[PDB]
Amino acid sequence: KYYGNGVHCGKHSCTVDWGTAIGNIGNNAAANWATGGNAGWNK
């Protein structure tokens, strides 16, 4: 399911093996990067 390039599909876009990390990143970019990321994404 998760082993390589495009396999994990997975949000219909086929979310890439980085999926949930890039999810948390993009979420806290929208929430907190107005401060420059003073708290940031997953610490």
Compute the distance between CA of residue 19 and CA of residue 33 in angstroms, rounded to an integer: 20
DSSP classification of residue 33: G
- Containing H/E element for 23? helix 19-32
Tell which CATH architecture fits domain 1-43.
Up-down Bundle (1.20)
**Residue 32, exposed/middle/buried by CB under 10 A (0-12, 13-18, 19+)?**
middle
DSSP classification of residue 34: G
Break the chain into its structural domains and give their ranges: 1-43
Phi/psi for 18 (5° steps) reads: -85, -5
Taking the mean position of all CA atoms in its chain, how far away is CA 5?
16
Q: How many residues does the chain have?
A: 43
